[PDB]
Ligand binder design. Sequence first.
Ligand SMILES: Oc1c(Cc2ccccc2)c(Cl)nc2ncnn12
Ligand SMILES: Oc1c(Cc2ccccc2)c(Cl)nc2ncnn12
Ligand SMILES: [K+]
Ligand SMILES: [K+]
Lengths: 215, 215
Amino acid sequence: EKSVSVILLAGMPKQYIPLLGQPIALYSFFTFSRMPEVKEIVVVCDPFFRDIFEEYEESIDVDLSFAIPGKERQDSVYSGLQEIDVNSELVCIHDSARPLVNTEDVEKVLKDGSAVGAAVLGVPAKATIKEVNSDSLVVKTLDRKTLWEMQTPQVIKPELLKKGFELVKSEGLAVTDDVSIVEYLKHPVYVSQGSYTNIKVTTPDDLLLAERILS
Amino acid sequence: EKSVSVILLAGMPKQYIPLLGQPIALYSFFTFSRMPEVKEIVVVCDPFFRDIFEEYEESIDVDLSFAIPGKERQDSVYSGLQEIDVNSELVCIHDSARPLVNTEDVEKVLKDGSAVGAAVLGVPAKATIKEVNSDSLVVKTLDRKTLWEMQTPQVIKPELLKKGFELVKSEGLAVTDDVSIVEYLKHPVYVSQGSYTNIKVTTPDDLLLAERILS
Ligand SMILES: Oc1c(Cc2ccccc2)c(Cl)nc2ncnn12
Ligand SMILES: Oc1c(Cc2ccccc2)c(Cl)nc2ncnn12
Ligand SMILES: [K+]
Ligand SMILES: [K+]
């Protein structure tokens, strides 16, 4: 209990558009707040939108903190990381554009993060996805490989994430997707099987789909 | 001109639900029919739905043929393959659940199919997608690889596709995704860059999205 620090990434933005009267960002916010494992939520957002979360501070059973967003997603993660409780055993990074994450799936990725050191929610990729080289040719592999689409939460022990940022900074390495920093480390990353309902709200068509799932 | 045979895969089914009053399957059907390169369309469908396509035979400037569907998608491809003109230089396989394919993108993949021998429409995968091993761990690769989501058409020289089917049959090989048969061959497969609008209609949420794009 109260071992986990959540970093909620929320930096006309899509994550503040209402679903059934509630801004998208508040759905995951409340899901995390109800979990006894969660001690605190560090919301990374433009100071303009702080009131959206601040309104519920005494109602929720977590500490609320804020951090300023950065230029890219990993900079926002780093900013949030500076505000967590010094004794938190686990950091739980979530895209606020994913409002429909199930408590049960958060529980799973928290467990796996604790066990392995780093874990992320994923689902099997349904489409035919292939590696393509610089001459636009399919890179053929009869060595079979199952591909998974990553979601959030991404759950990691704070010291491991900090070492990841330190390595990328010191050596000046390229950050290209949402698990690139840990990919440079030798520490394993577990993929916790999530739900296809945990969609990211990018456009008004997702905005619509999110609302159906809520029904 | 008239060098291409289209195999249109259409076997309460999703591909016969109307978009703006026209069954989904007819959209790609008509797109192909207007192209001078296309000589014929072999529709693979349950005999029950033949009338949907048969209604327009004298109106369209292509030959119309039919083939019975098989158990899996590759069996339907094989059935359609048996009906093409004996002198067709190119077979153009299309999922009828993709009604929004642009003529310009069909032209591109036809060109690339002719040049390379095998080509497929694709777009860069937007999500973070990773290989995951049997212990549910991310298979790390600092050797960077750009992943692409495959669409249709899949365009191939008939003799190459036939050799692919012959190899899979003779050796009893596993067909696991929509490009597995050519993956066993040494012949290259080109990925022609398509459009994100060329979506597959799997559910009523796609059914809705397809209709927006049409507006
Ligand atoms: O490596 C990371 C992590 C860390 C992490 C934690 C758990 C599983 C997998 C990756 C995060 Cl939160 N954000 C990131 N953005 C780019 N890279 N990158
Ligand atoms: O290999 C294939 C092809 C052939 C092809 C043609 C052009 C590009 C890539 C693959 C087709 Cl149409 N369908 C398939 N279903 C399973 N495998 N498989
Ligand atoms: K989307
Ligand atoms: K879909």
